[PDB]
């Protein structure tokens, strides 16, 4: 489509006007409402305008991008209270959201690649500009050099596919099939880094911690899903070779999910534990993607949609304790039930959404993902039970130790909870239970 | 200017005497006087006064719009049974009306607009056969449906197509 | 404000062993008369033994510690309101500065209490300037 | 501060909402407008739109066509579900000498 793109393009001059910070998120929620209205999509590409079109996977990912960026302007009031550069922050957020909409509504592989690697420069700018740590240089360089080092040979793979086929469109490239090892490694390993593996994760827990709240939303909300969207577009023509080489990645992802779930029990930071928590769920997503079933692909799309909300909502919760208690340390964050009792509703409602929860879309994504992985092999029942047990062994630890117990002595006086924060964590959880209603929307993209 | 703390400076007052173990290791008599003054300060004689501004700010006009006639019902019964015995019969009138409204709406929905063969998302009701004992009409009884098309029809046998 | 010192005397060690032995004896024998009879028996066992020297007392103190570790009850009786009990610190009292973060309309419900708190704030800041200032 | 100052609070001592910390006018406007663009547009009117959304996916049409097809297939009685994509007489299979050593997958 072009309406949303030109809406953000004409929302670009809102940044240069003084005292215009809160109108931009109003117009962003308005264009999210308009994007809720334009929902006539089926499994093929619809609303074809030049090189821009949309199917159901692209619809869900653009809607998630708009919701995460609209809440990202709502979460960052620390940028508005200080005289930190609001115009540059708004311009970077609008440009980054426009690049995410352009790389998700891309009809072809190459424009997807171009806006996909254009998206990492505003994330770089947010991490090195608006963070609160001395190691922001260690944060952005790890992210950029990891993704760039594994995504440069993907361009050689992309033009090898173009030279063998002729076209760049997803449907015409779905017809062909390749039997090459190095083409498979080029077109897969960039997404295998962009979603967290066990071995290649390092950029993730050292880039989530040192970023701002907005870097945390944009990294754990939609930029762990660029790799998932890319693998959902690439795996269709590399089925024979991924069936040869998928047991290595699935075994590494499952053992790495168990091991990173064992890491989070030995983590002393709130923002680092959610950073490693993004590794464990996307390990289940990666293990269910390579089985190529209908249920694996549908449950992977459902779990990426339901994870981009819940991980970002958990990252807003660690920010509103970092703003008041002064540190992200888990030892300091103790007994917040007696400090902010009304926040503890949103802590447990968004920590339960990280595990299997009764009304959330995360359970409907996790059920449809464990179906495919148990269907893939019977040996995976040993390590899926361990991973899904350790997931709530660590995820209950963050709510339990931060929101229950004796109070941390020697804490100075801070402000109380605000209606903006309650609204911010309201919109990270009510989409998770209102989307099981009309769940055939957000699951059946095929 | 925006004051989050109401215009007064926030600080601790009772000090180190709030812990039970710090109370027992030793007290200077000025700390004994401070703890006694804090315990006499923490007592309250009368209850909280009914601030009308809290009721004004903590109630939207829609809430007053849909709670006005039951408030009139509670106010016209206020001198008859007192405040406590009239708010109870006011609160169990509107809640009973809501319960009967929900019962009537659910009854209307599950017996007049249940799930049929033209829609997936409705509530698809399946009923079992009632037990027939003698004294009922037609005790020699077999299963009425026997065809495979009669099972789980969801109103397909009355389709116009 | 006397912070306790970590050195423990030998008489303090045998007094702590006597206290823990009678607490274990109270845990083992629930009836008060049988516990009293066994407590007088254990007191006579200690009182026949207090006339020895220091090194023999240290070695037999270690033997008594090993014996008390051997005969320790699986469910020792403890007071509920004290530390380590069944219902220790069931409620956690937050510090009073959150009372300073109430709404003024919420502060209007206890205006005499908040006026007394605002009066006590000046006394506390002069007391803190006297003590640590 | 005294007892009558807390009993009647000053209107200038106002507790801010989360949106602005400079003046009271920008708090109320941004609070009411942000609650307008999220709750009564993106969660209630949008959910009402998505409740009465038409058959974008053809799941209702699939159920109606399945009921009509199961009405008509068991009347003919050939197959409730057809196992073959095309007719077995229409497909021209290659001969055994034509294939040679080719990987036949089943």
């Amino acid at each position: 489509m072009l309406k949303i793109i030109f809406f953000l393009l004409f929302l670009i001059p809102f940044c240069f006007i003084n005292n215009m910070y809160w109108m931009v998120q109003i117009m962003m929620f308005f264009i999210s409402f308009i994007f809720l209205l334009m929902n006539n999509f089926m499994n093929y590409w619809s609303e074809i305008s030049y090189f821009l079109g949309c199917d159901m996977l692209s619809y869900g990912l653009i809607l998630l991008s708009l919701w995460i960026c609209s809440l990202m302007l709502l979460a960052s009031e620390m940028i508005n209270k200080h005289n930190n550069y609001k115009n540059l922050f708004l311009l970077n957020i609008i440009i980054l959201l426009l690049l995410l909409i352009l790389t998700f509504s891309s009809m072809s592989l190459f424009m997807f690649y171009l806006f996909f690697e254009s998206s990492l420069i505003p994330t770089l700018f947010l991490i090195l500009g608006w963070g609160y740590q001395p190691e922001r240089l260690q944060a952005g360089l790890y992210l950029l050099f990891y993704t760039l080092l594994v995504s440069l040979p993907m361009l050689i793979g992309i033009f090898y596919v173009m030279n063998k086929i002729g076209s760049m469109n997803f449907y015409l490239m779905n017809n062909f099939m390749f039997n090459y090892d190095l083409l498979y490694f080029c077109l897969l390993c960039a997404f295998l880094v962009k979603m967290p593996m066990f071995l290649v994760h390092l950029w993730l827990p050292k880039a989530h911690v040192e970023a701002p709240v907005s870097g945390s939303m944009i990294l754990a909300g939609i930029m762990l899903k660029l790799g998932g969207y890319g693998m959902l577009r690439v795996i269709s023509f590399l089925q024979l070779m991924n069936l040869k080489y998928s047991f290595v990645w699935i075994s590494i992802s499952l053992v790495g999910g168990v091991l990173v779930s064992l890491v989070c029990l030995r983590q002393t930071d709130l923002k680092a534990l959610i950073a490693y928590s993004s590794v464990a769920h996307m390990g289940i997503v990666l293990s269910g993607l390579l089985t190529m079933t209908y249920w694996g692909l549908c449950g992977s799309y459902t779990l990426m949609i339901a994870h981009g909300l819940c991980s970002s909502g958990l990252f807003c919760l660690a920010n509103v304790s970092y703003e008041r208690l002064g540190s992200r340390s888990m030892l300091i964050n103790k007994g917040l039930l007696n400090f902010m009792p009304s926040m503890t509703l949103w802590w447990f409602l968004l920590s339960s959404a990280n595990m299997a929860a009764p009304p959330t879309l995360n359970l409907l994504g996790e059920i449809s993902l464990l179906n495919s992985i148990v269907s893939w092999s019977w040996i995976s029942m040993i390590l899926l039970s361990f991973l899904s047990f350790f997931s709530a062994a660590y995820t209950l630890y963050l709510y339990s130790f931060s929101q229950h117990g004796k109070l941390f002595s020697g804490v100075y006086s801070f402000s109380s909870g605000k209606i903006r924060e309650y609204l911010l964590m309201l919109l990270h959880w009510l989409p998770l239970n209102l989307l099981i209603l009309k769940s055939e929307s957000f699951m059946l993209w095929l | 200017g925006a004051s989050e703390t109401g215009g007064v400076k926030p600080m601790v007052i009772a000090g180190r005497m709030v812990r039970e173990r710090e109370r027992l290791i030793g007290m200077s008599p000025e700390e004994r006087a401070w703890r006694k003054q804090w315990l006499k300060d923490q007592e309250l004689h009368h209850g909280p006064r009914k601030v009308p501004a809290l009721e004004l700010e903590l109630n939207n006009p829609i809430k007053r719009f849909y709670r006005a006639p039951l408030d009139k019902v509670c106010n016209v019964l206020e001198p008859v049974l007192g405040f406590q015995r009239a708010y109870t019969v006011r609160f169990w009138t509107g809640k009973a009306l809501l319960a009967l409204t929900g019962i009537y709406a659910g009854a209307y929905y599950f017996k007049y607009n249940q799930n049929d063969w033209t829609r997936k998302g409705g509530w698809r009701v399946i009923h079992s056969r009632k037990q027939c004992v003698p004294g009922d009409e037609g005790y020699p009884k077999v299963s009425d449906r026997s065809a495979p098309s009669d099972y789980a029809a969801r109103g397909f046998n009355e389709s116009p197509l | 404000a006397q912070v306790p010192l970590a050195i423990v005397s030998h008489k303090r060690q045998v007094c702590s062993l006597y206290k823990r032995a009678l607490r274990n004896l109270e845990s083992w024998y629930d009836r008060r008369n049988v516990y009293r009879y066994r407590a007088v028996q254990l007191r006579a066992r200690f009182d026949e033994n207090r006339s020895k020297d220091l090194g023999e007392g240290i070695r037999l103190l270690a033997c008594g510690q090993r014996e008390l570790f051997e005969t320790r009850h699986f469910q020792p009786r403890n007071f509920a309101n004290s530390a380590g009990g069944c219902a220790f610190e069931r409620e956690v009292i937050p510090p009073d500065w959150v009372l300073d973060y109430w709404h003024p309309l919420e502060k209007a419900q206890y205006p005499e209490y908040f006026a007394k708190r605002e009066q006590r704030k000046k006394e506390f800041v002069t007391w803190w300037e006297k003590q640590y200032g | 501060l005294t007892t009558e100052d807390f009993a009647n609070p000053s209107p200038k001592n106002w507790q801010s909402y989360g949106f602005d910390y400079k003046d009271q006018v920008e708090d109320r406007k941004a609070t009411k407008s942000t609650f307008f663009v999220t709750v009564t547009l993106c969660l209630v009117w949008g959910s009402f739109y998505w409740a009465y959304l038409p058959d974008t996916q053809f799941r209702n049409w699939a159920q109606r066509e399945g009921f009509l097809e199961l009405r008509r297939r068991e009347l003919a009685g050939v197959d409730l579900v057809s196992p073959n994509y095309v007719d077995p007489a229409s497909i021209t299979l290659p001969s055994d000498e034509d294939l040679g050593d080719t990987e036949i997958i089943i």
Binding site: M340, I419, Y422 | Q42, L58, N60 | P94, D96, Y101, H103 | -
Partner: peptide, 19 residues
């Protein structure tokens, strides 16, 4: 009647009424 030391619940109630 001792006065319990509770944090402020005005903002949560105003959020509930606005919602």
């Amino acid at each position: 009647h001792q006065m319990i030391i509770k944090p402020s619940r005005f903002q949560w109630d105003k959020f509930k009424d606005l919602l």
